[PDB]
Design an enzyme around this catalytic site. Structure first.
Site, short mmCIF file in Angstrom:
data_model
loop_
_atom_site.label_atom_id
_atom_site.label_comp_id
_atom_site.label_asym_id
_atom_site.label_seq_id
_atom_site.Cartn_x
_atom_site.Cartn_y
_atom_site.Cartn_z
N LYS A 1 -11.95 5.66 28.28
CA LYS A 1 -11.22 6.74 27.61
C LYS A 1 -10.63 6.21 26.32
N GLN B 1 -9.59 1.99 24.97
CA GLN B 1 -10.28 1.36 26.08
C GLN B 1 -11.66 1.99 26.26
N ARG C 1 3.78 -3.60 1.78
CA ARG C 1 3.12 -2.87 2.86
C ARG C 1 1.70 -3.37 3.09
N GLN D 1 -2.31 11.31 32.02
CA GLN D 1 -1.38 12.24 32.64
C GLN D 1 -1.17 11.81 34.08
N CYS E 1 -10.52 6.17 42.68
CA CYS E 1 -9.21 5.66 42.25
C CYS E 1 -8.30 6.80 41.82
N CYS F 1 0.82 -1.20 0.00
CA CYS F 1 0.00 0.00 0.00
C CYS F 1 0.86 1.26 0.00
N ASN G 1 -3.47 9.17 -0.08
CA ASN G 1 -3.12 8.12 0.87
C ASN G 1 -3.54 8.56 2.26
N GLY G 2 -4.41 7.78 2.89
CA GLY G 2 -4.90 8.10 4.22
C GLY G 2 -6.40 8.02 4.34
N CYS H 1 -7.88 5.22 48.15
CA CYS H 1 -8.69 4.01 48.27
C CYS H 1 -8.65 3.52 49.71
N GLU I 1 -0.10 -0.37 31.10
CA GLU I 1 0.89 0.44 30.40
C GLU I 1 1.99 0.94 31.31
N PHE J 1 -5.09 -0.82 0.34
CA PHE J 1 -5.11 -1.82 1.40
C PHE J 1 -6.41 -2.60 1.47
N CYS K 1 -12.73 -3.82 46.70
CA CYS K 1 -13.26 -2.57 46.18
C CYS K 1 -14.75 -2.47 46.48
#
Ligand SMILES: Cc1cc2nc3c(=O)[nH]c(=O)nc-3n(C[C@H](O)[C@H](O)[C@H](O)COP(=O)(O)OP(=O)(O)OC[C@H]3O[C@@H](n4cnc5c(N)ncnc54)[C@H](O)[C@@H]3O)c2cc1C
Ligand SMILES: Cc1cc2nc3c(=O)[nH]c(=O)nc-3n(C[C@H](O)[C@H](O)[C@H](O)COP(=O)(O)O)c2cc1C
Ligand code: SF4
Ligand code: SF4
Ligand code: F3S
Lengths: 1483, 348
Positions: free
Chosen positions: A927, A924, A31, A933, A1098, A1, A229-230, A1103, A876, A209, A1092
C-alpha cells in the site's frame, strides 16, 4: 529553495527592491539541499521590469524610443560564435519580416570567475536584442503578440536546425536574469544589477532544489511570465490535451500566426516551463492573467458547498474546456502592470506576505525573510486556498479576491448557459431488459473470470461497499514471467506519489475531489460561448446498461454515436487500423461518441485487448487533432476490477460498461444467492468501482478524473518499447518485453480454450490471492513453508538447502531468477570469507506494527535481531517504554529502528531518542500511496495505551506525511529527526518505480543516511487487493536505477542502500548485493518461521497461530521462538558465504556492485516471452565508488541550540534547576529546542523535568519546525512569528507565541503561525496569539491549545486533547476527528456547522461546570502569557462567551468516555472498566 | 471474520452401536444432518494456501487430496446451504465421491491448518453428506456425450483407475471397453473392500450409470489365454493397463504348510461373494465362528479380516504387528504437515 517577491503597490521603481530580493534569495538558500559541492549554483533567477534608464545610460548608441513602444530580448547562446551570428541574422530577418525594427544588440557582462566549476563550464554567452514597434501597433498587446510570434518562430527554427540557444525572456515590460547561480552569485555574475540605474516597481525571485545534480541554465526560472514552486502530476495528460487542442485552435487576434505558434508547449521542457508557456499563450489569446490562472488551476467546485453560485457556474463551465493542472503548486505570475499569486486547490505550499504602511509588499514562502519595522508593518497575512492575491501597479491598490472572482464570473451568464444548453439522457422506464447471453460461462472463461474472482471481488463489493481487503502482498510471478496466459492489464502497474508531491485522502477531502466527466465535443476554447457546454455530463464514468442504451439511442444530430467492434482474427495491427479508419469516418460524418465493443465475438473473432485499443485510438486522435471532438465508451467483458477501470480511464476511456459483470450478478441473483436485487447490485457495483478509482487517483494525488484520464499513471512491465511508442507513448518500460504478436497470441489462446472447453460447466478456481494445486506459482507454497519451518525447528541445513532450491529453481518467480553466475572464476575456501556473524549485521526484520502483529511475535523478532546484532523495526504503532530495558535473562525487546509514518501515533522525544535508526516510511510495497484505518473494535486497550489513544475509538493514518509536501520538506523533516537524535541514522523507505533513482538522488541531496527500496511483493497486515496486486514494481529495477544514478551523480558513497521484498534465499541476498544493496530486509519469512502458514487472514484478526492477531485465545497458540529466527538468519548468511566463495569474493563491499558476474540464463531465452527483455539496463557498471564512505555531514554544528542554548543549559539540565535565557532568532534557525528536549529526555525520560524549569525566549521570526519534540519542563516563548510545523511531535512542555510589541494591529486578524502545527503531538499545551494556517492540529493526541483563528482542514485527524479557537474556522473542519474536543467561538453557528464536517462529530453547548472552568483557566493562562485583547474581552463577558461558544466532540469518543465514567462511579478499577466498556461498545 | 473454528467443536454423525453392529453386514456410519454439516463446514477458514489440497508424498506419506479437491469451496457452499453447487464443484474433480466419502482415510484432515492445536474439519463426512444428498435428490444422471468419435481404448481392469479412465474417455467421445476377470465389476471396491465399509449396492449403481453412459463393461475374462495382446493391439488403438496390484508376499519360514492358512484376499473375496450370492449360505467360503483367528500383518486388510471374523462370531480373534504401538499425540519429529502417526482405534 522557494519563491518570493518584493514590490511597491503604487509602482515606485528603486534599486533597494532588487537588493532586498537578492537578500530574500540568500535567506531562502538554506532550504535547498547540498550537492557534490556547495559553490555550484543549484539554480536561481530574478524577474524585474524593463530598466529603461540603465539601458539608455549603458547603450550610448542605440536610439531607444519611449517606454512601451520597444521590447528587450534575452538570449543564452553557445560559446561557439558562427552559430551565434547565424541565429542573430535569422532573428533579425524574422523581425524585419514581421515589420518591427531591430534597434540593436548588446552583450551582458559576466563574471565567470565568481561561479562554480560546473556552471563555469556550462556558462553560455548572454546577448540581448532590442525591438522597436512599428507605428501600426497602437496598443502594447499587439506588440507583445508580435514579440511572442517572433520568439516562437525563432525557437521552432532552432529546434529544426538542431541549434542550442534559449530565449530566457522577450517582452516590453519584463526582464529575467537567471541561471545555475546561488543568491550570492547572481549579483556577482550579473554586474548590471550592481548599477544603481536598475529601477523596477517589483522584483520576483526563485531558487530551485535540483533533485538531480545535472541541471541546466534553461530549466531555471522565473520563466517568461511566472514562478512556480512545487510539482505537476498531470503533465502527460495536460500536454496531450493541449497538443490536441492546438490543431483546432482558431483566433482572430493571432490570425494566421497560429501555424507559426502551433507547438505552443515544448516537449523537452519541465512542468513549470510548460505551465508558463500555456499561461502566456492563453494571455495573448485574449484572456486576462487572473482568468487564465483560474482556468488552469480552478478551485474545487464539485462536492464543495462553500462556493458561491456564480463561481460554481464559472468553474463548471471552464471544466468543459480546460482540465486542471493538479499537484502542489504555488504560482506567482506577472505581466508588468499586474501581479498575481495563487495556490493549488488543496493548498499544499506555504505563502505568507507582509503589507507595510509605506505601500510595500513582501511575499514569500517564509516569513522571517527580511528585517522589517513592526511599527511599519500593517498586515501579516497568508495566501489562502481558493484566494488570489492580485496587485495592479497602475491602479496602486490590491484588488480583493472577492471582487476579482465576482467580476470574472459575472462577465458572462455561465449559469444560464449551463442551465439551457445541458442535454438530458433520461432513459425510458419500460425499456428494462435484464441482459443474459446463455453463453455466460464461455464468455467468462474467454475474459478470464474465475470462481475466486467472483466470490472474493464481486460479492464482497456488493456486501461492503468497498474494494475487498487483503494481506501478504503478491508472491506470484509477473505476467511476463508467468507461463499461463495473462491479461494485458496485469502488465501495467499503478504508479503513486512518493516524493515531490504527496498523496491525498479522498474520503476526508471529498470537497476537493471530482468525478465529473464530460461527453461530447469541446467548443472553441479561445472564444467560448454556449456551445462549449452543449454536451453530456456524468457523475460517474461507470455506465449501467440502461445508461449505455440511452446514450446509444440519443440519436440527436448534434450528439451522434458510432459503434466499432474491436475484434481481430490474425492481424492485430490491421484491426487497430480499421478501428482508426472507422473513427475518422465517423468524425467526418459528425459523430461525437465512439463505442468500442467486444461483443459479437466468436471463436473466429477474438476481442482486442481493450486497454490497447483505447490507448491506440486515444494516441491516434491526439496526433490527428480529433480527440477533443469525440468521447470514448468501452463495452468490454474484460472490465471487472478497479485496476481495469483505472487503466482504461487513464489511457483514454471516457466511460465503461461492464455488461459481463452485470450478467454475472444477474445469474448469481437468479440462482438464489445474492438476495439483493439486480438494480441495487448494479448501482452498488458502480459506486464502489468509482470509489476505488478515486482512491487510485488519490495514491498519486490527482483529485480529478478529468486530469487522471489524460494522465498515464501506469508503468508497463514486459512491453516492448516499440509497442509502447506506437500505442502507449510516454509510458515507461525499462526492460521492454513482449510484442504485439505475442499479445495477440495470448488473447487468441485464452479465447480458443474458453470457446472449446468441452469438458466442464464450471469456472476454474483462481490463484491470484490464494494457492491452488495446478494454479499459478506462489513463492510461499506449502512445500516451501513446511520445509522452512522444519529446517528452522531442527536447526538442520539440508532441509534449508532443499527449501532454498525449491524457492529459487523449478519456476521463474522474479526477475533475479533469470540471472545466472558466470561460473568461470577462482573459487576460494569458506575460511577465506567474512564470517556469518559479520554478515548478519546487514540484515533486518522489517517493519511490522505492534497492532498488526501480536506482542509475542514482535518481542520475539526484536529479541532475535538484538541477539544476532542486527536491527529490528518497530512499525507505526509505537513502542512500549518498558521494552527499552533489557530483561534480567539478557533478552532485549527494544527495536533498534523506529518508524515514522503519517500517523505519528507513538512518536515522542523518548521514543525517538531511544533508538539507533529513525526510518521515514514514504511508502510500502503493498500500500505505497495509501494510508490505513484501525476500527475501534480492533483498537484494544493494550494497543490504545501504546499509541496514546482512547480504547474503542477508531484510528486513521492519513496517506501522506502532512509535513512532507516536497523534497525540501523531506529535508526539513530529516533535519528535525537528526536534531532529535544526533546519534542516530536517518533512513528513508521508498518503493521501486520509474524515476526512483532521481528521487534517491534528491534524497541524498536532502541528506538521508540510508535509502531503502521496497518491491511491490512486500507484505502487509491489511490493504486493498487491487493495491496489493497492481501497484508498484519489483525492487530489482528500482535498486539498479538508484545505484546507477547515485554513482553518476557522485552521491553513492554518501548513502547506504537497502532493499526488501521477497528476500527468501542467500541467492536473493547475493543478487541484491550485486545490484548494489548493502542492507537487506526480511519480514514474511520470519513470520513463516514463527508459525505463519500464509493464511492471508491478518486483516481479519483470526490468525490460528497467534501471529497477526490480538485475541488472547489465538495468542495462546503461539509457538514461535527467537532461536528459529536466529537459525534462519545464520543459514542465510552461510548461503551467502558459500556463494561468495564460489564467485571468488572475499568481502561484501568487494562483491557489491559487480554486475559483470551475472549473465542471462538459458531458461530465460527458452521462455517464450521472458527472452524479449533487455536486462542490459540492470547490467551496467558506471565508473565510481560502490560503497558508503562519507558519513553525510549534517549541519548540527553551527546550530543555535549548540552554539548558545546548550552551553548555557547543560548544567541546568544536569542539576535539575531552573534556567531562563533569551535569544534573537531568524528564519535560518529552524528547530530551536529539539536538541535540548532530546537531552532532557535522555537524562530523565517520559517524566521529563518539573513544569516551567527551562525557559527559552526568542525574539523575531522563527524557522520551520519550531518547538518540535519538546518534552515536559521546557517553556518556549516567541515574540514575533513562526513558520510551518510549529510544535511538531510535541511530547509536553509549553509553546507561547505572541505578536511583536511594535505591531499594533489586531492579532486575531493578523496571521502569526504557519500552516501545519502540532502534527502528531502527544502531550503539552500551547498558546498562539493570532491566526494559523491549513491543517492545524492534524494528529493531536493530548495537546491543549488556544488559537485566535485557523485555516482549512483544522483538527483533521485528532485523537485526543483539546482545541480552543477564538476566531473563524476554515472549511472541512474536524475532517477525520475520532477523538478530542474542539471549542469554537463564533456568531454564526449555522455557518460554522456548514463549514464543519458532519460525518463523525456532534454539536453541543458548554453546560458542564468542570469544562467551563477548564476553558476559563485556559483563557486566563493565555491572556496572562499573551496580553490578548480578545481573551480579556471574553473573560470580562464570560457569561455571554459561554453561551455563544460551540463544542465539537466525536460520538464514539463521548460514548466511550461516558461508559468509562459510569463504570468508575459504579466502582470498577480502571483496567477492568476499560475492558468492559470496550467489549460493550464493540460486541 | 468467521470464528467457527473457535466457537464450534468437532462432532460425529450417527453411528450404530458396535455391539449390535456385528449382527448385520451394513454401513457402520451415516452422513451428517443438514444442521451438523453446516456447523462443521463453518469451521473451515477458507484456508489461505490450503494445506488440505497439496496432494503429495511428504516423508513417504501422502498429505492432502491427491485429486486436488476444492475442499474450502464446497465447505463454504455447505455452510451457506448451497448443495447443488457444492456437488457440482466436487464432481469437477472427483468422479466417484461416494466411495471416498466412506473409504478414504482423509489425509487432508491430518494435513490441514486447523489440525494444529485443534481437531480438523470432517472433510470426508462432509463429502459423504454432499454425495448422499445429491443421490437422494437425483441430481446425478448420465451426461450422454453427444459428441462420439469412433475410437477404442479397451481399458483392462475394473478398478477405480479403470472406471475413472473409462468415464474420462467416454466424456471425451471415445467408445471404450473395460475387461474384468470377476463376475462383478468394481475391482478392489467390489471384493477387497468389505461390504461393511462400502456396500456394493452403490458400486453396482455406479456401474449401471457407466453402462448407461456407454462404457460397455465385459466380465469373466482373464484377457490372457482368453484374449491375446496381439489381437488386442490389432483391434484397438490404445489398450491401457489398469491391472492393479494383487500379488501378496509370503513368509519363507518353516511351519507355513499345515492346512488352515489362506490368503486374506481370498478369504475376503469368498466371504463377500457368498454374501452377495446367497447370504453366506452356499458355504463356499471360510467360516471360523468356533475357530480361533490369528491375523498377522496390520493395516486395512487386517482390520477388514478382524471385522469379518467378528461378524462371523469367531470365539477368539487376534491381531499381530511387529511395528510398535503409535503414541496418543504427535511426536517432536512429526508435526502437522506430515501424516499423523498417532493412535486411531478405527473400526473392527
Ligand atoms: C479404507 C481403505 C481400505 C482398503 N482395503 C484394502 C484391502 O483390504 N485390500 C487391498 O488390496 N487394498 C485395499 N485398499 C487399497 C485400494 O483398494 C487399492 O489401492 C485400489 O482400490 C486399487 O486400485 P486399482 O484401480 O488398481 O483397482 P484394482 O481392483 O486393483 O484394478 C484391477 C482389477 O482388475 C483385476 N484384474 C487383474 N488382472 C486383470 C486382467 N488381466 N484383466 C482384467 N482384470 C484384471 C484385478 O483383480 C482387480 O480386480 C484400501 C484402501 C482404503 C482407503
Ligand atoms: C504483517 C505485515 C505488516 C507490515 N507492516 C508494515 C508497516 O506497518 N509499515 C511498513 O512500512 N511496512 C510494513 N510491512 C512491510 C515490511 O515491513 C517490509 O517493508 C517489506 O514489505 C517486507 O517484504 P517481504 O514480505 O517480501 O519480506 C509489513 C509487512 C507485513 C507482512
Ligand atoms: S480445514 Fe483444511 S480445507 Fe479447511 S481451511 Fe483448514 S486446511 Fe484448508
Ligand atoms: S477424504 Fe475426500 S477430500 Fe480428503 S483426501 Fe480423501 S478424497 Fe480427498
Ligand atoms: S498470513 Fe497472516 S493470518 Fe496468520 S498464518 Fe500468516 S500471519
Amino acid at each position: 529553495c522557494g519563491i518570493g517577491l518584493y514590490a511597491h503597490l503604487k509602482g515606485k521603481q528603486t534599486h533597494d527592491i532588487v537588493k532586498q530580493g537578492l537578500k530574500m534569495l540568500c535567506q531562502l538558500d538554506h532550504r535547498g539541499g547540498q550537492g557534490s559541492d556547495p559553490d555550484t549554483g543549484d539554480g536561481a533567477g530574478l524577474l524585474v521590469q524593463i530598466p529603461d534608464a540603465f539601458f539608455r545610460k549603458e547603450c550610448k548608441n542605440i536610439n531607444l524610443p519611449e517606454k512601451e513602444r520597444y521590447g528587450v530580448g534575452m538570449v543564452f547562446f553557445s560559446q561557439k560564435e558562427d552559430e551565434r551570428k547565424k541565429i542573430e541574422k535569422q532573428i533579425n530577418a524574422l523581425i524585419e519580416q514581421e515589420g518591427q525594427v531591430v534597434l540593436g544588440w548588446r552583450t551582458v557582462p559576466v563574471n565567470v570567475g565568481k561561479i562554480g566549476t560546473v556552471a563555469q563550464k556550462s556558462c553560455p554567452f548572454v546577448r540581448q536584442v532590442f525591438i522597436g514597434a512599428s507605428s501600426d501597433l497602437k496598443d502594447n498587446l499587439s506588440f507583445e503578440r508580435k514579440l511572442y510570434v517572433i520568439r516562437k518562430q525563432a525557437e521552432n527554427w532552432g529546434v529544426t536546425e538542431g541549434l542550442d540557444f534559449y530565449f530566457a525572456s522577450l517582452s516590453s515590460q519584463t526582464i529575467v536574469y537567471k541561471g545555475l547561480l546561488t543568491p550570492e552569485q547572481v549579483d556577482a555574475f550579473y554586474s548590471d544589477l550592481q548599477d544603481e540605474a536598475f529601477v523596477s516597481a517589483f522584483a520576483l525571485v526563485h531558487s530551485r532544489f535540483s533533485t538531480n545534480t545535472f541541471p541546466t541554465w534553461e530549466r531555471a526560472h522565473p520563466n517568461r511570465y511566472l514562478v512556480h514552486n512545487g510539482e505537476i502530476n498531470t503533465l502527460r495528460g495536460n500536454i496531450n490535451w493541449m497538443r490536441a487542442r492546438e490543431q483546432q485552435f482558431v483566433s482572430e487576434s493571432f490570425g494566421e500566426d497560429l501555424n507559426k505558434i502551433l507547438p505552443i508547449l515544448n516537449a523537452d521542457g519541465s512542468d513549470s516551463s510548460i505551465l508558463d508557456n500555456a499561461f502566456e499563450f492563453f494571455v495573448m489569446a485574449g484572456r486576462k492573467p487572473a482568468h487564465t490562472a483560474m482556468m488552469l488551476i480552478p478551485e474545487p467546485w464539485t462536492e464543495n458547498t462553500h462556493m458561491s453560485k456564480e463561481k460554481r457556474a464559472f468553474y463548471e463551465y471552464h471544466s468543459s474546456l480546460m482540465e486542471p493542472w493538479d499537484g502542489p503548486t504555488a504560482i506567482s505570475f506577472t505581466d508588468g502592470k499586474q501581479i498575481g499569486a495563487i495556490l493549488d486547490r488543496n493548498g499544499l505550499r506555504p505563502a505568507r506576505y507582509y503589507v507595510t504602511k509605506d505601500d510595500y509588499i513582501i511575499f514569500s514562502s517564509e516569513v522571517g525573510v527580511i528585517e522589517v519595522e513592526q511599527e511599519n508593518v500593517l498586515y501579516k497575512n497568508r495566501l489562502e486556498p481558493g484566494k488570489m492575491l492580485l496587485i495592479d501597479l497602475e491602479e496602486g491598490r490590491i484588488i480583493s479576491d472577492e471582487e476579482v472572482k465576482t467580476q470574472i464570473a459575472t462577465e458572462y451568464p455561465y449559469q444560464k448557459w449551463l442551465e439551457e444548453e445541458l442535454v438530458q439522457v433520461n432513459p425510458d422506464p419500460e425499456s428494462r431488459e435484464e441482459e443474459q447471453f446463455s453463453d455466460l460461462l464461455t464468455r467468462q472463461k474467454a475474459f478470464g473470470y474465475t470462481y475466486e474472482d467472483i466470490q472474493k471481488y464481486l460479492i464482497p463489493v456488493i456486501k461492503e461497499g468497498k474494494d475487498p481487503l487483503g494481506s501478504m502482498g503478491n508472491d506470484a510471478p509477473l505476467a511476463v514471467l508467468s507461463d499461463r496466459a495473462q491479461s494485458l492489464f496485469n502488465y501495467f502497474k499503478q504508479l503513486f506519489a512518493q516524493v515531490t508531491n504527496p498523496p491525498i485522502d479522498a474520503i476526508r477531502e471529498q470537497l476537493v475531489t471530482s468525478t465529473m466527466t464530460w461527453l461530447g465535443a469541446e467548443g472553441d476554447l479561445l472564444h467560448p460561448s454556449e456551445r462549449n457546454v452543449r454536451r453530456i455530463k456524468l457523475y460517474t464514468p461507470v455506465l449501467s446498461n440502461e445508461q449505455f442504451y440511452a446514450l446509444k439511442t440519443i440519436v440527436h444530430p448534434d450528439l451522434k454515436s458510432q459503434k466499432i467492434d474491436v475484434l481481430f482474427s490474425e492481424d492485430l495491427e490491421r484491426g487497430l487500423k480499421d478501428m482508426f479508419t472507422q473513427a475518422e469516418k465517423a468524425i467526418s460524418q459528425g459523430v461525437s461518441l465512439l463505442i468500442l465493443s467486444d461483443k459479437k465475438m466468436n471463436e473466429r473473432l477474438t476481442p482486442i485487448p481493450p486497454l490497447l485499443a483505447v490507448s491506440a485510438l486515444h494516441q491516434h486522435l491526439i496526433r490527428k487533432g480529433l480527440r477533443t471532438k469525440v468521447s470514448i465508451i468501452v463495452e468490454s467483458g474484460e472490465a471487472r476490477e478497479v485496476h481495469h477501470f483505472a487503466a482504461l480511464i487513464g489511457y483514454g476511456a471516457d466511460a465503461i460498461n461492464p455488461y459481463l459483470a452485470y450478467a454475472t450478478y444477474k445469474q448469481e441473483i437468479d440462482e438464489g444467492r445474492l438476495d439483493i436485487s439486480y438494480e441495487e447490485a448494479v448501482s452498488k457495483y458502480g459506486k464502489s468501482i468509482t470509489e476505488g478509482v478515486v482512491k487510485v487517483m488519490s495514491k498519486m494525488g490527482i483529485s480529478t478524473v478529468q486530469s487522471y484520464r489524460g494522465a498515464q499513471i501506469f508503468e508497463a512491465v514486459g512491453i516492448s518499447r516499440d509497442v509502447i511508442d506506437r500505442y502507449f507513448s510516454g509510458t515507461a518500460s525499462q526492460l521492454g518485453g513482449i510484442d504485439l504478436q505475442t499479445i495477440a497470441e495470448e488473447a487468441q489462446r485464452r479465447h480458443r480454450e474458453a470457446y472449446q472447453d468441452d469438458y466442464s460447466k464450471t469456472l476454474e478456481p483462481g490463484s491470484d490471492f490464494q494457492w491452488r494445486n495446478g494454479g499459478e506459482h506462489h513463492a510461499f507454497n506449502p512445500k516451501t513453508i513446511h520445509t522452512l519451518q522444519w529446517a528452522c525447528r531442527r536447526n538442520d541445513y539440508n532441509l534449508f538447502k532443499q527449501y532454498t532450491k525449491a524457492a529459487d529453481e523449478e519456476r521463474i518467480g522474479f526477475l533475479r531468477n533469470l540471472f545466472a553466475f558466470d561460473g568461470n572464476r577462482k573459487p576460494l575456501k569458506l575460511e577465506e570469507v567474512e564470517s556469518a556473524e559479520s554478515i548478519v549485521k546487514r540484515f533486518k526484520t522489517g517493519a511490522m506494527s505492534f497492532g498488526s502483529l501480536s506482542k509475542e511475535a514482535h518481542e520475539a523478532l526484536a529479541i532475535a535481531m538484538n541477539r544476532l546484532g542486527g536491527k529490528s523495526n518497530s512499525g507505526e504503532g509505537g513502542e512500549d517504554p518498558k521494552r527499552f530495558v533489557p530483561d534480567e535473562n539478557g533478552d532485549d525487546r527494544r527495536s533498534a529502528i523506529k518508524q515514522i509514518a503519517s500517523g505519528r501515533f507513538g512518536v515522542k522525544s523518548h521514543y525517538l531518542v531511544n533508538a539507533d535508526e529513525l526510518q521515514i516510511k514514504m511508502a510500502q510495497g503493498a500500500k505505497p500511496g495509501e494510508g490505513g484505518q484501525l476500527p475501534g473494535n480492533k483498537v484494544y486497550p493494550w494497543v490504545a495505551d501504546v499509541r496514546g489513544s482512547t480504547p474503542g475509538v477508531g484510528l486513521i493514518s492519513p496517506p501522506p506525511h502532512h509535513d512532507i509536501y516536497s523534497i525540501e520538506d523531506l529535508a526539513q523533516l530529516i533535519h528535525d529527526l537528526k536534531n532529535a537524535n544526533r546519534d542516530a541514522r536517518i533512513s528513508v523507505k521508498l518503493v521501486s518505480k520509474a524515476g526512483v533513482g532521481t528521487i534517491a538522488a534528491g534524497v541524498a541531496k536532502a541528506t538521508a543516511d540510508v535509502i531503502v527500496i521496497s518491491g511491490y511483493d512486500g507484505g502487509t497486515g491489511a490493504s486493498p487487493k487491487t493495491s496489493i496486486k497492481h501497484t508498484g514494481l519489483p525492487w530489482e529495477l528500482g535498486l539498479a536505477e538508484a545505484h546507477q544514478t547515485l554513482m553518476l551523480n557522485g552521491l553513492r558513497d554518501r548513502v547506504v542502500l537497502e532493499t526488501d521484498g521477497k528476500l527468501m534465499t542467500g541467492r536473493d541476498v547475493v543478487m541484491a548485493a550485486l545490484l548494489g544493496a548493502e542492507e537487506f530486509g526480511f519480514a514474511t519469512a520470519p513470520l513463516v518461521v514463527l508459525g505463519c502458514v500464509m493464511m492471508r487472514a491478518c486483516h481479519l484478526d483470526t490468525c490460528p497461530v497467534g501471529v497477526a492477531t490480538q485475541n488472547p485465545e489465538l495468542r495462546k497458540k503461539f509457538m514461535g521462538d527467537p532461536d528459529h529466527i536466529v537459525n534462519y538468519m545464520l543459514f542465510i548468511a552461510e548461503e551467502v558465504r558459500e556463494y561468495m566463495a564460489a564467485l571468488g569474493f572475499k568481502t561484501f563491499d568487494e562483491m557489491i556492485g559487480r554486475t559483470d558476474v551475472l549473465h542471462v540464463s538459458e531458461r530465460a531465452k527458452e521462455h517464450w516471452k521472458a527472452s524479449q527483455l533487455d536486462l542490459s539496463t540492470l547490467l551496467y557498471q558506471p565508473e565510481g565508488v560502490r560503497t558508503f564512505q562519507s558519513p553525510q555531514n549534517h549541519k548540527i554544528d553551527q546550530s543555535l541550540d549548540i552554539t548558545t542554548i546548550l552551553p548555557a543549559v547543560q548544567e541546568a539540565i544536569e542539576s535539575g534547576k531552573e534556567a531562563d535565557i533569551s535569544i534573537e532568532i531568524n528564519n535560518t534557525n529552524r528547530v530551536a529546542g529539539t536538541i535540548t528536549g532530546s537531552e532532557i529526555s535522555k537524562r530523565y525520560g517520559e517524566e521529563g523535568l518539573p513544569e516551567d524549569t527551562i525557559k527559552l525566549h526568542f525574539t523575531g521570526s522563527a524557522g520551520q519546525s519550531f518547538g518540535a519534540f519538546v518534552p515536559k519542563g521546557m517553556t518556549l516563548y516567541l515574540d514575533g512569528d513562526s513558520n510551518d510545523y510549529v510544535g511538531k511531535g510535541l511530547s509536553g512542555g509549553k509553546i507561547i507565541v505572541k505578536s511583536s510589541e511594535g505591531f499594533n494591529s489586531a492579532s486575531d486578524d493578523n496571521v502569526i503561525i504557519g500552516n501545519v502545527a502540532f502534527y502528531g503531538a502527544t502531550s503539552g499545551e500551547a498558546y498562539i496569539n493570532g491566526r494559523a494556517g491549513e491543517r492545524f492540529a492534524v494528529r493531536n493526541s493530548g495537546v491543549n491549545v488556544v488559537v485566535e483563528g485557523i485555516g482549512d482542514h483544522g483538527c483533521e485527524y485528532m485523537t485526543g486533547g483539546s482545541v480552543v479557537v477564538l476566531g473563524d474556522v476554515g472549511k472541512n473542519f474536524a475532517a477525520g476527528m475520532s477523538g478530542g474536543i474542539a471549542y469554537v467561538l463564533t456568531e454564526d453557528v449555522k455557518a460554522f456547522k456548514r463549514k464543519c464536517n458532519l460525518e463523525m462529530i456532534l454539536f453541543e453547548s458548554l453546560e458542564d461546570e468542570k469544562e467551563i472552568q477548564q476553558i476559563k483557566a485556559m483563557l486566563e493562562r493565555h491572556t496572562a502569557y499573551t496580553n490578548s485583547q480578545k481573551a480579556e474581552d471574553l473573560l470580562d463577558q464570560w457569561e455571554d462567551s459561554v453561551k455563544k461558544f460551540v463544542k465539537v466532540i466525536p460520538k464514539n469518543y463521548k460514548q466511550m468516555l461516558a461508559s468509562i465514567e459510569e463504570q468508575k462511579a459504579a466502582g470498577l478499577s480502571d483496567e477492568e472498566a476499560i475492558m468492559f466498556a470496550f467489549e460493550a461498545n464493540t460486541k | 471474520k468467521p470464528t467457527g473454528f473457535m466457537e464450534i467443536k468437532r462432532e460425529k454423525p450417527a453411528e450404530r452401536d458396535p455391539l449390535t453392529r456385528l449382527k448385520d453386514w451394513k454401513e457402520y456410519s451415516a452422513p451428517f444432518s443438514e444442521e451438523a454439516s453446516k456447523r462443521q463446514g463453518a469451521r473451515c477458514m477458507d484456508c489461505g494456501t490450503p494445506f488440505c489440497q497439496i496432494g503429495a508424498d511428504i516423508n513417504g506419506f501422502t498429505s492432502g487430496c491427491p485429486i486436488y479437491n476444492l475442499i474450502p469451496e464446497w465447505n463454504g457452499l455447505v455452510y451457506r446451504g448451497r448443495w447443488k453447487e457444492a456437488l457440482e464443484r466436487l464432481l469437477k474433480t472427483n468422479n466417484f465421491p461416494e466411495f471416498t466419502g466412506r473409504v478414504c482415510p482423509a489425509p487432508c484432515e491430518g494435513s490441514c491448518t486447523l489440525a494444529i492445536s485443534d481437531p480438523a474439519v470432517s472433510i470426508k463426512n462432509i463429502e459423504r453428506t454432499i454425495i448422499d444428498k445429491g443421490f437422494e435428490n437425483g441430481w446425478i444422471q448420465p451426461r450422454i456425450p453427444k459428441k462420439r468419435t469412433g475410437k477404442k481404448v479397451a481399458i483392462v481392469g475394473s478398478g477405480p483407475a479403470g472406471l475413472a479412465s473409462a468415464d474420462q474417455l467416454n466424456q471425451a467421445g471415445h467408445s471404450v471397453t473395460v475387461f474384468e476377470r470377476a463376475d462383478r465389476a468394481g475391482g478392489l471396491l467390489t471384493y477387497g473392500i468389505p461390504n461393511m465399509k462400502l456396500e456394493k449396492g452403490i458400486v453396482e449403481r455406479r456401474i449401471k450409470l457407466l453402462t448407461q453412459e456407454g462404457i460397455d463393461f465385459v466380465t469373466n475374462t482373464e484377457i490372457g489365454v482368453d484374449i491375446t495382446a496381439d489381437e488386442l493391439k490389432e483391434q484397438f488403438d490404445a489398450v491401457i493397463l489398469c491391472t492393479g496390484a494383487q500379488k501378496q508376499r509370503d513368509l519363507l519360514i518353516e511351519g507355513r504348510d499345515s492346512k488352515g492358512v489362506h490368503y486374506a484376499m481370498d478369504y475376503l473375496t469368498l466371504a463377500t461373494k457368498s454374501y452377495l450370492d446367497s447370504n453366506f449360505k452356499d458355504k463356499q467360503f471360510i467360516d471360523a465362528k468356533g475357530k480361533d483367528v490369528i491375523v498377522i500383518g496390520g493395516g486395512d486388510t487386517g482390520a477388514d479380516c478382524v471385522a469379518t471374523a467378528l461378524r462371523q462370531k469367531a470365539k477368539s480373534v487376534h491381531q499381530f504387528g511387529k511395528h510398535p504401538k503409535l503414541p496418543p499425540a504427535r511426536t517432536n519429529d512429526n508435526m502437522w504437515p506430515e501424516q499423523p502417526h498417532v493412535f486411531t482405534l478405527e473400526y473392527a
